[PDB]
Structure formats: C-alpha cells, structure tokens
C-alpha cells in the first residue's frame, strides 16, 4: 500500500495473508471455511494466515490453514486479467472472533465516489521495495467508468473498477493482490492490477466482485 497508514493490529478482521514459506498475495474471508483472492495468486501449497498483523512474528491470534482446494475462475484469462477471482476453500473452519471475522457479499454494485478501505502487506515504494511488517490500510474512492477507461484505453472490461487517485501517490501495489477493497461493510473489489504503483493518472484496478456473487454462492454451495 503506498501512501496508507497502519491499520492497528485486528482492526481489519476479515483479512488474510496467503503464504508458501513467504507472504505473495492478500485474500478475504467470507465465512469459515472459504476465502477469496485473485486467480493471478493461484499456486500449489497455499496455506491461509488469518488474525495477523505482523507477519513475520506470532504475536497471538493466529490461525495458520492448509487450503484444501483453489477454485480459479474458468474464464480467467492471464493475458487481460478478466474474472481475476478465486475461491480456496479452508482444510478446517476457522474459529470466528472479533480478530477473525468474515466480510459480506455486496447486493448491488457500488457507484463512484464510493469510499472504500483497501489493505494489505504489499510494498509500500511507488519506486523500490519496502515490505512492511504490519498491515496497511489506504482509504480510496471508487472512480468513473471514464475516467478509468480514459486511463487504460482497451483495458477495462466490465468485470473491473478503478478506485484511486488520479494525482498520485496513494495506490495499492505488488503484494497486495488478491485482497480488499470494502465499501459500507460489503466486499467490492479485489487488488488485481495497475501501471506501476501511485503513478499520476494511472490508478489501480480491481476485480468488481458485485458481478460474481452468484458464481461465489453456487460455487461455495456445490464443493
Ligand atoms: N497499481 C496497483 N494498484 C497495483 C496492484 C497490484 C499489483 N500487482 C503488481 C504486480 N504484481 C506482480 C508482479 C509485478 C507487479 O508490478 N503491480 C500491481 C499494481
Ligand atoms: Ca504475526
């Protein structure tokens, strides 16, 4: 996350970190066994850490899970990172707290202008890496479909949102894919890509989950 703050240990309870020996990418919980990231995250030997804050120390309320099975969209498509979703499912159920918590689907698609908190342990240097050990929060609005085509002309499908500065300097970044982006308590977006990190006039781009939950929910319901 460039230009964010620290969130505060379990302030952003339904966040999860996929880890294979090393944090790579962010992810979301939405009910006890299953979690929801992006389809570019997918790799063999997944396990899920929920309640933490630092990664790199067990400072209490963790739950490290093995992901019993990753369900890639069937019409992701690498090249333009359309349906850039994914659903892994958990080897146990997690046990739900007030550090651990699921997030809501959204019932309707969020408008422009909507405000909304994306997080994340990704790099935090528009220009160089700077990892950082707790979670980052960035507060960003949702922009309009012109301004987000304008940006990335022959980019944007309708599967995908801006939300960002135009000006620069706050953005999500490498390492914070798969995970975030909530608007009024429901999850709207999910970190998918963007030109380089805070550029001016280059915002991010996120998978708008509005237009999978039907996917989500008959998934879910037949695994
Ligand atoms: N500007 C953004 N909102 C953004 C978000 C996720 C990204 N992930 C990456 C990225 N991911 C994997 C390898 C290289 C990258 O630059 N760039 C990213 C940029
Ligand atoms: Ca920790």
């Given at each position: 996350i460039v230009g964010g703050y620290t969130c505060g240990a379990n302030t952003v309870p339904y966040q999860v970190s996929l880890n294979s020996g090393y944090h790579f990418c962010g992810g979301s919980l939405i009910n006890s066994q299953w979690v929801v990231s992006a389809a570019?995250?997918?790799?063999?030997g997944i396990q899920v850490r929920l309640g933490e804050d630092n990664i790199n120390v067990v400072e209490g309320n963790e739950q490290f899970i093995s992901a019993s099975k990753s369900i890639v969209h069937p019409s992701y498509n690498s090249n333009t990172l359309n349906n850039d979703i994914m659903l892994i499912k958990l080897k146990s159920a997690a046990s739900l707290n007030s550090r651990v918590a699921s997030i809501s689907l959204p019932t309707s698609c969020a408008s422009a202008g909507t405000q909304c908190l994306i997080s994340g342990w990704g790099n935090t240097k528009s220009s160089g890496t700077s990892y950082p050990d707790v979670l980052k929060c960035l507060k960003a609005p949702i922009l309009s479909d012109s301004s987000c085509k304008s940006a990335y002309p022959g980019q944007i499908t309708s599967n995908m949102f801006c939300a960002g500065?135009?000006?620069?300097?706050?953005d999500s970044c490498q390492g914070d894919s798969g995970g975030p982006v909530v608007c009024s308590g429901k999850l709207q977006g999910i970190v998918s890509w963007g030109?380089?990190?805070?550029?001016?006039?280059?915002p991010g781009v996120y998978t708008k989950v509005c237009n999978y939950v039907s996917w989500i929910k008959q998934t879910i319901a037949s695994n």
């Open positions: 570019h995250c997918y790799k063999s500065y135009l000006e620069g300097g706050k030109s380089g990190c805070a550029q001016k006039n280059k």
